[PDB]
Structures are given as structure tokens and as C-alpha cells.
């Protein structure tokens, strides 16, 4: 019954709307605004590099809502990890999101 007005998946806002069918009275209807932001509370500054301070601000302008906080479940985020095993250093691509993407 609710039209999916916004289904943002990178800041996770899920704004929507509907018209509430009131009684058979004059049209003093109500329009709904079910905004539903979910706070990660444990992610980093860049979403793709776990070395920055964690997260203080959470800015949500709903006009730029149609850098991110959360991780897209169908997207893959990776990085270069500098391992060595002795003298050589094979900088190899790691996975910051094991299971959203496979090699």
C-alpha cells in the first residue's frame, strides 16, 4: 500500500509515503513520511579502509538521498594488504566484506 519513494542503500535511508484512508468524512486526509535511517555505529570514515577514526557524524540530507556509512550487500569492497613472509612483499588484494563477492 506504500509507494517506495526512496530505497537508498548506501546511506540506508528508506523514505516512503502513503495516504491514510480515514473515515468517509471531508478530505482531511494524512500523508505519511516513514523515513527510516539505520545507524551503523561501528563503521569507518572511508567505508573501504579500516585505518581511520570510527564515526561521529551522521548527516542525512533527504534531497541528496534519492562518502557512505554502510556496505552494499551486493557490492564488493576490497583492499591491498601488505603481507611479506620474509623478504619479498606480495601486496595482495584482501576482502573487507567476505561473502558479498567472491573471486
Amino acid at each position: 500500500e506504500r509507494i517506495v519513494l526512496v530505497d537508498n542503500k548506501c546511506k540506508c535511508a528508506r523514505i516512503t509515503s502513503r495516504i491514510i484512508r480515514s473515515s468517509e468524512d471531508p478530505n482531511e486526509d494524512i500523508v505519511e513520511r516513514n523515513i527510516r535511517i539505520i545507524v551503523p555505529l561501528n563503521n569507518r570514515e572511508n567505508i573501504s579502509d579500516p585505518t581511520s577514526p570510527l564515526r561521529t557524524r551522521f548527516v542525512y540530507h533527504l534531497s541528496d538521498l534519492c562518502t557512505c556509512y554502510t556496505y552494499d550487500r551486493n557490492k564488493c569492497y576490497t583492499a591491498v594488504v601488505p603481507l611479506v613472509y620474509g623478504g619479498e612483499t606480495k601486496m595482495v588484494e584482501t576482502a573487507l566484506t567476505p561473502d558479498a563477492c567472491y573471486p
Binding site: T51, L96, P98
Partner: protein, 114 residues
């Protein structure tokens, strides 16, 4: 918590479970650069109680107490065969491991908008 009270040293433990077979490679990085094996000690792969053939291993890293309170994010990177990318990692800092402060400053603007 009680280890960060004597103000002498802090131990971060990287525990790898379920991997089979043995002989997994583990190391630590401090602010994106690796450390010598003179500061972290790994354990031999031991069997698992409820698992038929899966194993587990521990790698402890000991650092100065004041080296962990100011930040200085540590990462544990491991590389076992079975990994789809053959290499994975995890990370902890003072603001992430069992925190005592959820310092939140979320702001929401332009509620009506277009």
C-alpha cells in the same frame, strides 16, 4: 578490561577457527605496516572439540598500554588456502573493541524536501 588497569601491557588475540587443514599463515600490521615476529606469538593448530577435523589457532600480540589507548589501530591478516581470496583480515582499535562510549552526533536536515 582488568588488563588495561595495571598500565603495563595489552594483549590482542587473533583467533582463527574452523580452518582445515593446518599450517595457516598469520601476521599483524600496525597502521598499515607489518611488524617483526619479535612482538607477536602464534600457536600451533590444535583440534576443535565439536568438530570432526576442523582446527583452531591463536596469535597473541603484546603492546605497551599507552600505545593502545591513543588509537594506533591494529590489524590481524591471515592467509589460509580455503579463503576465496586466500587472504583476509580483521581490525581493532581503542574505539571499537568493547567500547564504553557511543559518542553519536547524528544530524538530519531537510526533512520535507522535494
Amino acid at each position: 578490561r582488568e588488563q588495561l588497569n595495571l598500565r603495563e601491557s595489552a594483549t590482542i588475540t587473533c583467533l582463527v577457527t574452523g580452518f582445515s587443514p593446518a599450517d595457516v599463515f598469520v601476521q599483524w600490521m600496525q597502521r598499515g605496516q607489518p611488524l617483526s615476529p619479535e612482538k607477536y606469538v602464534t600457536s600451533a593448530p590444535m583440534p576443535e572439540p565439536q568438530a570432526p577435523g576442523r582446527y583452531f589457532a591463536h596469535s597473541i600480540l603484546t603492546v605497551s598500554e599507552e600505545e593502545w589507548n591513543t588509537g594506533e589501530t591494529y590489524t590481524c591478516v591471515v592467509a589460509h588456502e580455503a579463503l576465496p581470496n586466500r587472504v583476509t583480515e580483521r581490525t581493532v582499535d581503542k574505539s571499537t573493541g568493547k567500547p564504553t562510549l557511543y559518542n553519536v552526533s547524528l544530524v538530519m536536515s531537510d526533512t520535507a524536501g522535494t
